[PDB]
Symmetry: C3
Subunit: 344 residues, 3 copies
């Protein structure tokens, strides 16, 4: 909600409160999943060719007790400058540019968006990203959106590989960069490409048993159709030393594919059907080729209005239980989600 707009400065206090329950035979996901999000988004006019901005987004779990630990975290926190019509720069915790394309399939009622994770190189939300964007390809092509992003090393907790803000191997990165390019081809049809290259860290190449290599790389292509009450999107990503092999490390190579179809009825119901897979290749310890993710998703959202909705989502999990999924901690069970959400 816009709660301040005065003398060239604007502030939005926004969020949602999501009354959410999961039903699954997997006891690590079954049960109450209630949470909320709260954030601020602000803008300050500097001059005719310059606007300042900042955004913070917080996640607050509400499915555990008042004595539980580690229930809140920051999703986004960045500050930036917009340079007229010709671009922007921001720095902080923000989305990696790969998500410029992979966001197109991250539209399921509840599930989806899970062939990658957060703090996973530049695939999703990430610490310390400096992001340059231009929406007219340097004045040459209207509608052609370019991004270039740099990320500094976020290393180990201690020792030779450390930085101030250290973390475990699954969420480490070396210095890296990303780029994306997206374009509306026809009315309502868009195409996009993204690439990332990051140095890996010494702990990534020594602590977990899976995944070895100097660099983490991703290649993504996507398509979207959004018109006439119909939403279709597909994307394909090939990764190298970048996709998590559950708790066991990284996949030397992975091939990640998502497709989604939705329809918006004018009375407020939006059914959704999707297919997702992540195919790991050349895994160590005799694993070879393994499925990391494989499910059909069917669900629907009912929008009461712009501030209130309810939804059901059903993850039909096609993974077989085997020594890889067991050892890596990957859920092979179906899940049903039921939600009622207030947004502000």
């Amino acid at each position: 909600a816009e709660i301040y707009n005065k003398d060239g400065n604007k502030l939005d206090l926004y969020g949602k409160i999501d009354g959410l329950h999961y039903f699954s035979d997997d006891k690590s996901v079954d049960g109450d999943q209630t949470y909320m999000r709260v954030g601020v988004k602000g803008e300050t006019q500097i001059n005719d060719q310059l606007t300042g901005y900042g955004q913070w987004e917080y996640n607050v779990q509400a499915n555990n007790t008042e004595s539980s630990s580690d229930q809140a975290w920051t999703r986004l926190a960045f500050a930036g400058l917009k340079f007229g019509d010709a671009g922007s720069f921001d720095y902080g915790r923000n989305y990696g540019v790969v998500y410029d394309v992979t966001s197109w399939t991250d539209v399921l009622p509840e599930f989806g968006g899970d062939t990658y994770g957060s703090d996973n190189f530049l695939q999703s939300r990430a610490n310390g990203v400096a992001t340059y964007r231009n929406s007219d390809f340097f004045g040459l092509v209207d509608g052609l959106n370019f991004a270039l992003q740099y990320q500094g090393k976020n290393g180990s907790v201690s020792g030779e590989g450390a930085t101030n803000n250290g973390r475990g191997w699954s969420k480490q990165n070396g210095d890296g960069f990303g780029t994306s390019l997206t374009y509306d081809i026809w009315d309502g049809i868009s195409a996009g490409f993204a690439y990332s290259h990051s140095k890996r860290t010494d702990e990534q190449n020594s602590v977990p048993a899976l995944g070895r290599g100097d660099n983490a790389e991703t290649y993504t292509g996507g398509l979207k159709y959004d018109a006439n009450n119909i939403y279709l999107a597909s994307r394909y990503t090939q990764t190298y030393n970048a996709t998590r092999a559950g708790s066991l490390g990284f996949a030397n190579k992975a091939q990640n594919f998502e497709v989604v179809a939705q329809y918006q009825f004018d009375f407020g119901l939006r059914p959704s059907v999707a297919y997702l897979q992540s195919k790991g290749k050349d895994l160590e310890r005799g694993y070879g080729d393994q499925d990391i993710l494989k499910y059909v998703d069917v669900g629907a959202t009912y929008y009461f209005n712009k501030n209130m909705s309810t939804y059901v989502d059903y993850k039909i999990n096609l993974l077989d239980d085997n020594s890889f999924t067991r050892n890596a901690g990957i859920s092979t069970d179906d899940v049903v989600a039921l939600g009622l959400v207030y947004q502000f």
Copy 2:
């Protein structure tokens, strides 16, 4: 404070900042107790019959350092729909319906509200509650309200009894149900709850054994002519904590409070509270779990600022039960200055 009201949607950013200090011989409660609360309450008009709403309430302690852990937590987080005469429905972290009645005695300047706890079946705030409420009995009887409530299992951290949101035995529950009924300046109230207990509750702590946690509550309130009087009695089975040692197989909990509101802003308060545990294992037998007289006063400067003193006159004796279970037997004085928004 209402900070947004536009095109059918309203948002309140509300809270308080409570500069609070306790004086006690009990070193685990003595000292600075400053904290604040902040929350949002939102409502959206969907159509003539239907409004959607959400509420989040956060508690933020401010009595420890900037390197201290576990200083903030969510009290409430729920989303709901209100229908008209048909009632309301909400889901999330919210009050158990037993508090619809026991709240009538939870009005002391600082203390009170402590014969039960949070995440304690449906006695107070709870995870994963679905709550239906009906006002005026479908519009047929003015002042008659009722509620129906369901809670899904919140299990252990790992193993066979787990759920995603696992916790220790003290705050676990199986599937449960609660109901309340209140009727009106004089009011009477009843509440009942029934929850399945978990395998950890029946094996980890030494105290309390049974398949089910049950509560029965009756209460009365007089609120008129600047006088507030309230009393309630609750009988529980396998549901009242015996401090850190488990649950009381049975307990009998009683509270009574009297207050007067002077025009100039002073509100003195006198109360008596007790919790009596029966049939405790390990030789404990019958034990007092809580017993005190409370005297205090709140001074309201206005609707946004108050100050208060409260004096817990603790009538428990020190014994091996109070020591082992971590129950305070010392007197406490609280002094507070509070800003509300």
Copy 3:
């Protein structure tokens, strides 16, 4: 931002989002340092001579992951009354009155303000402070301000020295009090004093620092006019200045000086020198430098809501047994920040 003002009550929701990176050979400070702050400040008119107020300020780190621990904390939380000319009183988590004067040199683009820390007696933000303030000496002497402050013990986690809100020896305190006095002659002078009981764990746990009381004495001078900022202050402490992780300095001498200029087009360069000199340290340490650097940097103000900055800590400490064992950083640091304020 003031987001509510109605029927005698007002509320400000304020903060900043600071996109911040450090470059250093010290791996414990090097890298992303992005964070934000958010708070509320409210006031309510009670009557002609009485206003109530409250403030909360929260710090939220954003430089680590979504599964990281302990990433947020309360800086300030207090409630108070202002009685016109008779003064104000507030209680909660608030600044110690020593900061009334030492804040004069806490103006660097990024660094500075580090000859003391938080929860460090009455040197900075502190739990359980009751603070009386009087502005312009009961309305009788423009520019003459004073404060009186009391702080109850904040003790150990358990045992005989416990309080409900226990913490480690570095952040403990006994009962104490403090006072400040400032006088505006754009030119000001200031004095502050504090005296606290030390706690048993401050004497029994760490290697360094022994004594029943912690005391500080501060004097400051400030020139702030004609686009020029010049400030200096000197503090002598007893059993009160941390000697890194090793304990406290039996005596310390802390000195800071800063000069800045505000150009009309927005740039504010800054040059400063800071040192903390510890004396009579145990275990053979004797006299040791606790802090010693020159700071050079600049802030560019786009407007009142947006700025960018660079800061360069030129660290004059050396690797020796003291800095090494105390965990005191000896390396240079460059900070680069972009900050949105609301």
